[PDB]
Amino acid sequence: GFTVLSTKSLFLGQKLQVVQADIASIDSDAVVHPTNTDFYIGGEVGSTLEKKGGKEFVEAVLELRKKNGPLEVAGAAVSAGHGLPAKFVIHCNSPVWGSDKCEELLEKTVKNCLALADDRKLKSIAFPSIGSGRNGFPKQTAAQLILKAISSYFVSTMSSSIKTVYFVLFDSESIGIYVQEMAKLDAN
Ligand SMILES: [Au+]
Protein backbone atom coordinates (compact mmCIF):
# COMPACT_ATOMS: atom_id res chain seq x y z
CA GLY A 1 0.00 0.00 0.00
CA PHE A 2 2.90 2.35 0.74
CA THR A 3 6.29 2.99 -0.84
CA VAL A 4 9.67 2.53 0.82
CA LEU A 5 11.92 5.56 0.32
CA SER A 6 15.15 4.09 1.65
CA THR A 7 16.31 0.74 2.98
CA LYS A 8 19.21 -0.19 5.23
CA SER A 9 19.80 -3.88 5.78
CA LEU A 10 21.81 -4.48 8.93
CA PHE A 11 24.43 -7.24 9.03
CA LEU A 12 22.27 -9.31 11.37
CA GLY A 13 19.38 -9.37 8.91
CA GLN A 14 17.11 -6.57 10.12
CA LYS A 15 15.68 -4.30 7.43
CA LEU A 16 15.33 -0.64 8.44
CA GLN A 17 13.07 1.31 6.10
CA VAL A 18 11.98 4.92 5.84
CA VAL A 19 8.43 5.38 4.59
CA GLN A 20 6.13 8.37 4.18
CA ALA A 21 2.55 7.47 5.09
CA ASP A 22 -0.12 7.43 7.80
CA ILE A 23 1.54 5.39 10.53
CA ALA A 24 -1.93 4.26 11.63
CA SER A 25 -2.46 2.51 8.29
CA ILE A 26 0.76 0.47 8.32
CA ASP A 27 0.19 -3.27 8.64
CA SER A 28 3.12 -3.79 11.01
CA ASP A 29 2.93 -6.07 14.07
CA ALA A 30 3.49 -3.10 16.35
CA VAL A 31 3.18 0.64 16.03
CA VAL A 32 4.85 3.01 18.49
CA HIS A 33 2.73 5.73 20.10
CA PRO A 34 4.74 8.55 21.75
CA THR A 35 2.82 9.66 24.83
CA ASN A 36 3.27 10.97 28.38
CA THR A 37 3.01 9.58 31.90
CA ASP A 38 -0.80 9.53 31.69
CA PHE A 39 -1.11 7.89 28.27
CA TYR A 40 -2.35 11.13 26.71
CA ILE A 41 -3.63 10.41 23.17
CA GLY A 42 -3.81 13.92 21.70
CA GLY A 43 -0.41 13.82 20.01
CA GLU A 44 -0.14 13.78 16.22
CA VAL A 45 0.49 10.05 16.31
CA GLY A 46 -2.13 9.51 18.99
CA SER A 47 -4.63 11.51 16.94
CA THR A 48 -4.15 9.51 13.75
CA LEU A 49 -4.34 6.26 15.72
CA GLU A 50 -7.59 7.34 17.37
CA LYS A 51 -8.87 8.45 13.97
CA LYS A 52 -8.14 4.99 12.59
CA GLY A 53 -9.00 2.87 15.63
CA GLY A 54 -11.75 4.98 17.15
CA LYS A 55 -13.51 3.74 20.28
CA GLU A 56 -11.74 0.36 20.22
CA PHE A 57 -8.30 1.98 20.18
CA VAL A 58 -9.21 4.37 22.99
CA GLU A 59 -10.81 1.73 25.25
CA ALA A 60 -7.67 -0.37 24.98
CA VAL A 61 -5.48 2.54 26.03
CA LEU A 62 -7.85 3.47 28.84
CA GLU A 63 -7.64 -0.09 30.15
CA LEU A 64 -3.85 -0.11 29.87
CA ARG A 65 -3.63 3.17 31.78
CA LYS A 66 -5.73 1.62 34.54
CA LYS A 67 -3.64 -1.54 34.83
CA ASN A 68 -0.20 -0.04 34.27
CA GLY A 69 -0.42 3.10 36.38
CA PRO A 70 1.68 6.15 35.38
CA LEU A 71 4.17 5.47 32.59
CA GLU A 72 7.61 6.41 33.90
CA VAL A 73 10.04 8.40 31.77
CA ALA A 74 11.57 6.18 29.06
CA GLY A 75 8.97 3.56 29.92
CA ALA A 76 6.90 1.64 27.40
CA ALA A 77 3.65 -0.31 27.69
CA VAL A 78 1.53 -2.31 25.28
CA SER A 79 -2.17 -2.24 24.44
CA ALA A 80 -3.93 -4.49 21.94
CA GLY A 81 -4.21 -2.97 18.49
CA HIS A 82 -8.01 -3.21 18.49
CA GLY A 83 -9.44 -1.20 15.62
CA LEU A 84 -6.06 -0.82 13.91
CA PRO A 85 -4.12 -2.73 11.26
CA ALA A 86 -1.27 -2.99 13.78
CA LYS A 87 -1.55 -5.98 16.10
CA PHE A 88 -0.14 -4.05 19.06
CA VAL A 89 0.40 -0.46 20.09
CA ILE A 90 3.55 0.20 22.07
CA HIS A 91 3.14 3.42 24.06
CA CYS A 92 6.32 5.14 25.21
CA ASN A 93 7.07 8.12 27.43
CA SER A 94 10.14 9.81 25.98
CA PRO A 95 12.27 12.12 28.13
CA VAL A 96 12.12 15.85 27.45
CA TRP A 97 15.10 17.47 25.73
CA GLY A 98 17.09 19.05 28.55
CA SER A 99 16.47 16.46 31.27
CA ASP A 100 19.69 15.46 33.10
CA LYS A 101 20.12 12.24 31.11
CA CYS A 102 17.65 12.89 28.30
CA GLU A 103 19.91 11.39 25.63
CA GLU A 104 20.53 8.08 27.37
CA LEU A 105 16.85 8.07 28.33
CA LEU A 106 15.75 8.43 24.69
CA GLU A 107 17.93 5.47 23.77
CA LYS A 108 16.38 3.52 26.67
CA THR A 109 12.89 4.41 25.49
CA VAL A 110 13.60 2.90 22.09
CA LYS A 111 15.14 -0.24 23.56
CA ASN A 112 12.16 -0.67 25.88
CA CYS A 113 9.86 -0.52 22.83
CA LEU A 114 11.88 -3.09 20.89
CA ALA A 115 12.02 -5.38 23.93
CA LEU A 116 8.23 -5.33 24.26
CA ALA A 117 7.93 -6.33 20.61
CA ASP A 118 10.38 -9.21 21.05
CA ASP A 119 8.49 -10.33 24.16
CA ARG A 120 5.60 -11.04 21.78
CA LYS A 121 7.76 -12.42 18.96
CA LEU A 122 6.73 -9.59 16.64
CA LYS A 123 8.36 -9.41 13.23
CA SER A 124 7.82 -5.74 12.43
CA ILE A 125 7.59 -2.44 14.25
CA ALA A 126 6.80 1.05 13.02
CA PHE A 127 8.33 4.10 14.66
CA PRO A 128 7.21 7.68 14.11
CA SER A 129 9.71 10.43 14.85
CA ILE A 130 10.19 10.24 18.63
CA GLY A 131 11.66 12.85 20.97
CA SER A 132 11.88 15.59 18.34
CA GLY A 133 9.06 18.09 18.12
CA ARG A 134 6.73 17.43 21.04
CA ASN A 135 9.55 16.59 23.51
CA GLY A 136 11.92 19.24 22.16
CA PHE A 137 14.82 17.16 20.79
CA PRO A 138 16.51 18.61 17.72
CA LYS A 139 15.42 16.39 14.82
CA GLN A 140 18.95 15.25 13.96
CA THR A 141 19.86 14.52 17.57
CA ALA A 142 16.75 12.41 18.11
CA ALA A 143 17.29 10.51 14.86
CA GLN A 144 20.92 9.71 15.69
CA LEU A 145 20.05 8.46 19.17
CA ILE A 146 17.12 6.33 18.03
CA LEU A 147 19.16 4.67 15.27
CA LYS A 148 22.07 4.19 17.68
CA ALA A 149 19.69 2.47 20.10
CA ILE A 150 18.16 0.25 17.44
CA SER A 151 21.60 -0.74 16.14
CA SER A 152 22.77 -1.43 19.69
CA TYR A 153 19.65 -3.44 20.48
CA PHE A 154 20.12 -5.86 17.59
CA VAL A 155 23.79 -6.57 18.26
CA SER A 156 22.85 -7.26 21.88
CA THR A 157 19.72 -9.43 21.43
CA MET A 158 20.45 -12.58 19.41
CA SER A 159 17.00 -14.20 19.60
CA SER A 160 15.20 -11.08 18.31
CA SER A 161 12.21 -11.84 16.11
CA ILE A 162 12.07 -8.31 14.64
CA LYS A 163 12.83 -8.41 10.92
CA THR A 164 11.59 -5.01 9.74
CA VAL A 165 11.73 -1.63 11.46
CA TYR A 166 9.85 1.23 9.83
CA PHE A 167 10.44 4.92 10.31
CA VAL A 168 7.19 6.57 9.25
CA LEU A 169 7.77 10.24 8.56
CA PHE A 170 5.66 13.03 7.07
CA ASP A 171 7.90 16.03 6.35
CA SER A 172 10.76 16.17 3.85
CA GLU A 173 13.33 17.40 6.36
CA SER A 174 12.64 14.49 8.70
CA ILE A 175 12.91 12.07 5.78
CA GLY A 176 16.21 13.60 4.73
CA ILE A 177 17.52 13.43 8.28
CA TYR A 178 16.56 9.80 8.79
CA VAL A 179 17.95 8.58 5.49
CA GLN A 180 21.26 10.27 6.33
CA GLU A 181 21.46 8.75 9.81
CA MET A 182 20.30 5.30 8.72
CA ALA A 183 22.97 5.16 6.02
CA LYS A 184 25.63 5.39 8.76
CA LEU A 185 24.74 1.96 10.18
CA ASP A 186 26.62 -1.16 9.05
CA ALA A 187 28.10 0.57 6.00
CA ASN A 188 31.45 -1.25 5.72
AU1 LIG B 1 20.50 15.79 28.00
Give keywords.
monomer; 188 residues; alpha/beta; Leucine Aminopeptidase, subunit E, domain 1
Question: What does this protein look like?
Answer:
- This protein has 188 residues and is an alpha/beta fold.
- It has a single domain (1-188), classed as Leucine Aminopeptidase, subunit E, domain 1, CATH 3.40.220.
- It contains four helices and seven strands, in the order βββαββαβαβα.
- A seven-stranded mixed β-sheet has the order 1-2-7-6-3-5-4, with helices on both faces.
- Helix 3 (139-154) links the parallel strand 6 (124-127) and strand 7.
- Helix 2 (102-119) packs across helix 3 and helix 3 (139-154) packs parallel to helix 4 (172-182).
- The structure holds gold ion.
- Residues 102-103 line the site of gold ion (AU).
Helix and strand topology:
Layout: E1 4-9, E2 15-19, E3 30-34, H1 44-68, E4 76-80, E5 88-92, H2 102-119, E6 124-127, H3 139-154, E7 164-168, H4 172-182
Parallel strand pairs: 2-7, 3-5, 3-6, 6-7
Antiparallel strand pairs: 1-2, 4-5
Bound molecules: gold ion (AU).
What is shown here, in short?
It is classed as structural protein. Keywords: Alpha-Beta Structure, A1pp Domain, Macro-Domain, structural protein. It is built from four helices and seven strands, in the order E-E-E-H-E-E-H-E-H-E-H.
Number of helices: 4
Number of strands: 7
Q: Which kinds of small molecule does this entry bind, naming each only once?
A: gold ion
The CATH superfamily is known as: Leucine Aminopeptidase, subunit E, domain 1
Secondary structure category: alpha/beta
| Overall shape | globular
Strand content: 15-25%
Largest sheet: 7 strands, mixed
Helical residue percent?
A: 25-40%
Taking the alpha carbons of the first and last residues, their distance comes to: 32 Å
Q: Taking strands numbered 1, 2, ... along the chain, how are they ordered across the largest sheet?
A: 1-2-7-6-3-5-4
Radius of gyration, taken over Cα atoms and rounded to an integer in Å: 15 Å
- What number of structural domains do the residues give? 1
The helix/strand series, from N terminus to C terminus, equals EEEHEEHEHEH
Give the CATH topology. Leucine Aminopeptidase, subunit E, domain 1
In the CATH hierarchy, the architecture is 3-Layer(aba) Sandwich
CATH top level class name: Alpha Beta
Family: Belongs to the histone H2A family.
Protein name: Core histone macro-H2A.1
Cross-link (Glycyl lysine isopeptide (Lys-Gly) (interchain with G-Cter in SUMO2)): 139
Domain Macro: 46-186
